[PDB]
Design a protein around this motif. Sequence first.
Motif, PDB file in Angstrom:
ATOM      1  N   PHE A 267       0.853  -1.187   0.000  1.00  0.00           N
ATOM      2  CA  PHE A 267       0.000   0.000   0.000  1.00  0.00           C
ATOM      3  C   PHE A 267       0.890   1.238   0.000  1.00  0.00           C
ATOM      4  CE2 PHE A 267      -2.381  -3.373   2.211  1.00  0.00           C
ATOM      5  CZ  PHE A 267      -3.456  -3.485   1.348  1.00  0.00           C
ATOM      6  N   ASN A 414      -4.806  -2.230   9.478  1.00  0.00           N
ATOM      7  CA  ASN A 414      -4.118  -3.447   9.058  1.00  0.00           C
ATOM      8  C   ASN A 414      -3.140  -3.202   7.915  1.00  0.00           C
ATOM      9  OD1 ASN A 414      -6.231  -2.886   7.342  1.00  0.00           O
ATOM     10  ND2 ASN A 414      -7.237  -4.880   7.575  1.00  0.00           N
ATOM     11  N   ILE A 418       0.610  -4.700   7.475  1.00  0.00           N
ATOM     12  CA  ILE A 418       1.069  -5.467   6.317  1.00  0.00           C
ATOM     13  C   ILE A 418       2.363  -4.865   5.775  1.00  0.00           C
ATOM     14  CG2 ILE A 418       0.481  -6.071   3.918  1.00  0.00           C
ATOM     15  CD1 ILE A 418      -0.791  -7.826   6.063  1.00  0.00           C
ATOM     16  N   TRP A 576      -2.116 -12.731   4.064  1.00  0.00           N
ATOM     17  CA  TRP A 576      -2.227 -11.724   3.012  1.00  0.00           C
ATOM     18  C   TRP A 576      -1.536 -12.206   1.740  1.00  0.00           C
ATOM     19  CZ3 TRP A 576       1.186  -8.495   0.343  1.00  0.00           C
ATOM     20  CH2 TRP A 576       0.619  -7.371  -0.267  1.00  0.00           C
TER      21      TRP A 576
HETATM   22  C1  LIG Z   1      -8.369  -4.544   6.756  1.00  0.00           C
HETATM   23  O1  LIG Z   1      -9.607  -4.701   7.492  1.00  0.00           O
HETATM   24  C2  LIG Z   1     -10.784  -4.329   6.758  1.00  0.00           C
HETATM   25  C3  LIG Z   1     -11.952  -4.475   7.705  1.00  0.00           C
HETATM   26  O2  LIG Z   1     -12.114  -5.822   8.127  1.00  0.00           O
HETATM   27  C4  LIG Z   1     -10.910  -5.206   5.515  1.00  0.00           C
HETATM   28  O3  LIG Z   1     -12.050  -4.801   4.767  1.00  0.00           O
HETATM   29  C5  LIG Z   1      -9.653  -5.080   4.663  1.00  0.00           C
HETATM   30  O4  LIG Z   1      -9.728  -5.965   3.552  1.00  0.00           O
HETATM   31  C6  LIG Z   1      -8.408  -5.408   5.490  1.00  0.00           C
HETATM   32  N1  LIG Z   1      -7.203  -5.226   4.696  1.00  0.00           N
HETATM   33  C7  LIG Z   1      -6.152  -6.051   4.762  1.00  0.00           C
HETATM   34  C8  LIG Z   1      -4.994  -5.712   3.874  1.00  0.00           C
HETATM   35  O5  LIG Z   1      -6.137  -7.026   5.507  1.00  0.00           O
END
Ligand SMILES: *[C@@H]1O[C@H](CO)[C@@H](O)[C@H](O)[C@H]1NC(C)=O
Lengths: 595, 49
Positions: A267, A414, A418, A576
């Motif tokens: 990201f 999150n 990552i 991930w």
């Molecule tokens: C982070 O958390 C949100 C809410 O649960 C979710 O929609 C999103 O996909 C998550 N992103 C990652 C990279 O895990």
Amino acid sequence: STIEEQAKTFLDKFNHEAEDLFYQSSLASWNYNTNITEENVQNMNNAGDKWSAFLKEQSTLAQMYPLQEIQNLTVKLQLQALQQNGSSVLSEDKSKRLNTILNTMSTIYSTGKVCNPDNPQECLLLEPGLNEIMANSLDYNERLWAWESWRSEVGKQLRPLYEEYVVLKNEMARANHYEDYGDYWRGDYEVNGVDGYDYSRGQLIEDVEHTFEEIKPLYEHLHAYVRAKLMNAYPSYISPIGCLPAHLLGDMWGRFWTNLYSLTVPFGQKPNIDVTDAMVDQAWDAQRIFKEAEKFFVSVGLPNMTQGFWENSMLTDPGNVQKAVCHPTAWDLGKGDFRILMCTKVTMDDFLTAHHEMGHIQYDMAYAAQPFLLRNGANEGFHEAVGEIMSLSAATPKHLKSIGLLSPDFQEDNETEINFLLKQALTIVGTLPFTYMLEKWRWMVFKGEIPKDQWMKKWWEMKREIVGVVEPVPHDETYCDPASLFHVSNDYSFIRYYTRTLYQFQFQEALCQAAKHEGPLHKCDISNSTEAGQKLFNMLRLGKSEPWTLALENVVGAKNMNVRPLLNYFEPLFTWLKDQNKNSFVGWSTDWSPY
Amino acid sequence: NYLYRLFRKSKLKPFERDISTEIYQAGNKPCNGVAGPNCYSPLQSYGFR
Ligand SMILES: *[C@@H]1O[C@H](CO)[C@@H](O)[C@H](O)[C@H]1NC(C)=O
Ligand SMILES: *[C@@H]1O[C@H](CO)[C@@H](O[C@@H]2O[C@H](CO)[C@@H](O)[C@H](O)[C@H]2NC(C)=O)[C@H](O)[C@H]1NC(C)=O
Ligand SMILES: *[C@@H]1O[C@H](CO)[C@@H](O[C@@H]2O[C@H](CO)[C@@H](O)[C@H](O)[C@H]2NC(C)=O)[C@H](O)[C@H]1NC(C)=O
Ligand SMILES: *[C@@H]1O[C@H](CO)[C@@H](O)[C@H](O)[C@H]1NC(C)=O
Ligand SMILES: *[C@@H]1O[C@H](CO)[C@@H](O)[C@H](O)[C@H]1NC(C)=O
Ligand SMILES: *[C@@H]1O[C@H](CO)[C@@H](O)[C@H](O)[C@H]1NC(C)=O
């Protein structure tokens, strides 16, 4: 009257004169490293000579005490450390030739200059320039030219030298009652005579293999992701089914993958957790950085820093007139004298590195009470692991919000997790297959499993099979491609990084379950937990007096290397990477399909 | 110039002093006065810095 009491009295004499001469040697080395002047050079040379002379005569007097009739483990360990003949067991001609070979390898590696054809007016050295091009440039043919030219020149000038080096080191190890030089290097982890905690020289290879076999899925996913991003960077040269090109790994040799954070970012829109701006706005000088590290170490329960540490350490670059070595180093002078040589600046990095070196100094302080020849880590991995756990704990968002570098309203989503875990993976998980491959190649070439005329062909095959990196062009035996690295050209053990990497996360899990952390492992902080500092201090005080298996059982409750903490640390990143590798192919083929 | 006694055959009694510089015989062979293997001078120096 018995041999054991003679050994005790001889070790008392040796310890007293060793601590005095070692202190003079370390003080002269410190005076050279903080003040590069020719009188300091000759003082360091004279002190080093008198130290090596002392440790030689004392080893000669130490080998008159056989070990089979000594029952005390501490006396046995000190005499085992002292009785090592090193390079002296050979004849004078062969020993002199070995030292000449080592010196000329050092001078070829240090003064190796490789530059562009048709422009010979000035040329570029490895340390100032080659790291820059191989770590920042995005041009394929330029990196290919630098990589091939440096390996070509250094391999042609170093191959017969390594050819004689392996033979001389093998003769040295076999005269010293070892199977090969690889066994001599693996002897640091050997534990003999303690029931239940016994560890053999030969067991290390299968232990490393057993850990790497569980490392392989995570590494494969990481490799696939890196490959996809490099395919975005380089469109046609890299194949979906093949390995990575060797000159695209971000370093000269592929040891670290940390230079690919820009290309392989998950990201890019989210910022990092860099807190340099907060330090420069609030005027955090080097002294207060070390004071914050001290505050962390007194928060966890360990002792404060001595008065002589604050008085004698040079924690700032002195100036242009006085030259000093800028390498971060922790010094254990002895006689209760602990110092840090660090050209500290204001950065998040130097802050973490200061925590690392203060972890080194705390480790050196805990074991000070021990006898002189046991004042070291239990194995080569523990010393750097106990500093890297501090570097792990200090970089957390919780610790930065506790000490005011990070805002109290900062949202830890999150995506930044990552990002952090992928930077840590490129730095930590990336070096594991390279380290295991290099050490296993060195073990087999010392063992004689690899034929003399089959070196490169075996090495590249393993790079295809283990690391998943393919060579650009085939190399024959006129090249010596492993020897371009600093550790192998200058006679250094390499498995310490693998063991340190595993011990780091093992110590981190033990301290985080000791400190009652209720979240993921990467968010854990060991600050204000005195039971965790006590648990760690129960291992730090031992030094080299106890087996490393016993120290590991003291901390993590297990006596062997475990890979479960590392995979548990990278668990959300593992999920991930499993999620975003659906379209791509995980794993590699050993064919030369990219190039 | 500051010395201490590191090797002695038996422990000292209270308020006793030993000024002897006799070579401490730690083995079975006689030392014969000259310093050598398994024969250590008992007074060691306190190298203060
Ligand atoms: C982070 O958390 C949100 C809410 O649960 C979710 O929609 C999103 O996909 C998550 N992103 C990652 C990279 O895990
Ligand atoms: C280190 O080198 C010394 C010198 O060669 C070795 O001492 C010899 O050991 C052999 C085998 O036990 C004896 O036959 C010789 O008489 C010894 N010579 C002396 C002068 O003591 C010593 O064993 C070597 N130690 C190791 C661990 O290799
Ligand atoms: C560890 O303990 C120190 C001292 O109790 C904590 O520092 C306090 O944090 C609270 C946060 O609510 C502040 O209100 C206090 O002013 C702080 N006191 C001092 C002396 O700094 C610290 O937060 C604790 N935790 C960590 C992770 O360090
Ligand atoms: C460094 O060495 C020079 C050489 O003369 C000396 O003048 C100077 O005082 C030294 N610096 C320190 C801090 O000792
Ligand atoms: C070994 O010797 C040390 C002193 O040199 C002593 O403190 C320790 O108790 C001894 N260990 C055993 C098992 O006798
Ligand atoms: C040393 O640590 C103690 C707590 O163990 C603390 O109270 C004291 O202030 C520290 N010393 C200094 C100079 O900060």
